[PDB]
């Protein structure tokens, strides 16, 4: 067979240790899921420094906690705008997820609070910028570089899916690089906690699995498709399906004919054909062997999964740090005033935030 006694026992034991880990992780998650934290700071505790970008349904500002000097990334959601866009439940659920999950590659919610006008999610400041920026700056990542990031996403999805969470917005734009060069997943505005099938058309066009586009329902395997898209884009510098307009992108996704740059290794092409697989009886991450079909694939043969989790692997890129509160790794964005009405808006709809 492929493994002798020692290697087979080692792999078996590793796979059982993931099960034990996930069982404890679920216990911890459910306690926070059922009893969320609320109202852990207020706006005048923070100096507003600079806009870092956007997240679903809002804008993200670098802030400095006045009493400590610590910097954070604060997402500001305008309650009236959220109501108009029919995103009340999404925004409540994002905060509920963020305060309940705990994983080394998931951005942490350090504080949350609300006022008459807005909701505020104060997250860790991840100073290295978006993966998107670095990828577009250097064109494409080497396979070892892409694999280091991909491994973090594999582990993160293994964790999330064990909690019945589907992420649904994987893309380089949502992945931030921390000071040690590891990835932080942001934006749970499209995530859903559901067992089995769901139907919502949501996500980012280039990353949608065929079954999201089509009327049929879908499950967590859409995230494994999206991983395929991400790995392809990291290694190629462009995604596997693109076009001028989303409708044309969807046609290409549903057709599903993937082609690869000539520099892709055979191992990479094999993994991607198994992730970018229309047939759900064949897509990796959706089979009897679950996530192990991915983790044990030859393209990941050099990946020490525990060492990635423990953050003991040397990252391929360490972002420059100019000092506390430096934003040199970010684009500049329009600076919008934070206005707080003297009248409470939408109080009943956002009671749970």
């Amino acid at each position: 067979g492929h493994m002798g006694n020692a290697a087979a026992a080692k792999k078996g034991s590793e796979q059982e240790s993931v099960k034990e880990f996930l069982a404890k992780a679920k216990e911890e998650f459910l306690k926070k899921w059922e009893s969320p934290s609320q109202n852990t700071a207020q706006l005048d505790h923070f100096d507003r420094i600079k806009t870092l970008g956007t997240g679903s349904f809002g804008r993200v500002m670098l802030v400095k906690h006045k009493e400590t000097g610590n910097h954070y990334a604060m997402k500001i959601l305008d309650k009236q705008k959220v109501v108009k866009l029919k995103q009340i439940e999404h925004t409540l659920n994002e905060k509920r997820i963020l305060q309940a999950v705990n994983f080394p590659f998931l951005v942490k919610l350090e504080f949350s609070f609300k006022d008459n006008s807005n909701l505020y999610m104060v997250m860790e400041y991840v100073p290295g910028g978006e993966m998107f920026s670095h990828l577009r700056r250097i064109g494409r990542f080497s396979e070892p570089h892409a694999r280091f990031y991909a491994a973090q996403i594999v582990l993160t999805f293994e964790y999330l899916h064990s909690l019945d969470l589907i992420y649904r917005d994987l893309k380089p734009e949502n992945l931030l690089i921390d000071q040690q060069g590891y990835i932080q997943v942001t934006d749970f505005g499209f995530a859903k906690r559901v067992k089995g099938r769901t139907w919502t058309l949501c996500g980012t066009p280039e990353y949608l699995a065929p079954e999201i586009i089509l009327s049929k329902g879908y499950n967590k395997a859409v995230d494994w498709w999206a991983l395929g898209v991400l790995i392809y884009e990291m290694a190629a510098g462009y995604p596997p399906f693109f076009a001028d307009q989303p409708i044309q992108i969807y046609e290409k996704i549903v057709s599903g004919k993937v082609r690869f740059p000539s520099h892709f290794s055979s191992d990479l092409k094999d993994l991607l054909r198994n992730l970018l697989q229309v047939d759900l009886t064949k897509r990796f991450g959706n089979l009897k062997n679950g996530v192990n079909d991915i983790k044990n694939h030859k393209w990941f043969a050099t990946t020490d999964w525990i060492a990635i989790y423990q953050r003991k692997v040397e990252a391929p890129f360490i972002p420059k740090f100019k000092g506390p509160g430096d934003t040199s790794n970010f684009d500049d964005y329009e600076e919008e005033e934070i206005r707080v009405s003297i009248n409470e808006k939408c109080g009943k709809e956002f009671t749970e935030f």
Binding site: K171, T204, F242
Partner: peptide, 18 residues
């Protein structure tokens, strides 16, 4: 080339969710 097609697509910048 595929890369040139990508550059001509107008979708090389940040992509928003639907």
């Amino acid at each position: 080339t595929t890369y040139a097609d990508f550059i001509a697509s107008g979708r090389t910048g940040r992509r928003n969710a639907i």
